[PDB]
Ligand binder design. Sequence first.
Ligand SMILES: O=c1c2ncn3c2ncn1[C@@H]1O[C@H](COP(=O)(O)OP(=O)(O)OCC2O[C@@H]3[C@H](O)C2O)[C@@H](O)[C@H]1O
Length: 252
Amino acid sequence: RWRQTWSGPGTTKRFPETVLARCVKYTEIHPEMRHVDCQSVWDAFKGAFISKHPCDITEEDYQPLMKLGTQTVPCNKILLWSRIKDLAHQFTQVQRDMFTLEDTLLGYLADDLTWCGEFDTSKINYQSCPDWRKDCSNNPVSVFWKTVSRRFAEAACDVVHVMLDGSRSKIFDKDSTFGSVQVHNLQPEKVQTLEAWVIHGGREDSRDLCQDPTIKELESIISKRNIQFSCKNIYRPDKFLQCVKNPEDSSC
Ligand SMILES: O=c1c2ncn3c2ncn1[C@@H]1O[C@H](COP(=O)(O)OP(=O)(O)OCC2O[C@@H]3[C@H](O)C2O)[C@@H](O)[C@H]1O
């Protein structure tokens, strides 16, 4: 107990009860998911990683879960994000203008949780789980997010929006889930434009960050996919959120 197996945090306490409860809550609230059997969902989620080496997980392990979690999302209202999840969520919560991954049954089930199992034992590992960097990238949590994030990108059509954190060293980060998985799985046949909203953290008075080298990079990558690119600065996200809640506002 003075040295754990893995370098990452262990499985969230009460993980099984938490996931099952989340599934119940989501399916009570969202009527199109009203039929989903939540025991079946939990069984499939378990099936992905229980009794498996937590450095040997594949997208295949998650297919029963992905199937049970099949859900239509309005394809033209998708909001992607990188390193700025709270603003993304606060924004969609005002009046459901857009949908993030966390607004789907599967995103909702897993948000903020950690989980892993052990090879040749059916026990959940509450003590530690693999770190993506130090231990392995093919771990239960990372493989889950990669799979669901890919599928979410594949669902998009028309204008897709992305919120980016303009206070970061790399506003667009090629190594992020957004940059390494989602940008490459938008379907050029279906997606007309990717519109980036660069969210300032430099509080008030700041530059045109749509000119940032990494933004030019993003523009290049997506342009070469035959998708148009658009960018906007959000200089004061506090004002932005206020204008979303009350666009009948003078300052707006
Ligand atoms: O929805 C999630 C999500 N919820 C929780 N997490 C998510 N990751 C990716 N996504 C999807 O990818 C991106 C965000 O991932 P990121 O680019 O690595 O940002 P980021 O680096 O802020 O996301 C970090 C992050 O937080 C966990 C996951 O363990 C992970 O990699 C969004 O567009 C989502 O659609």
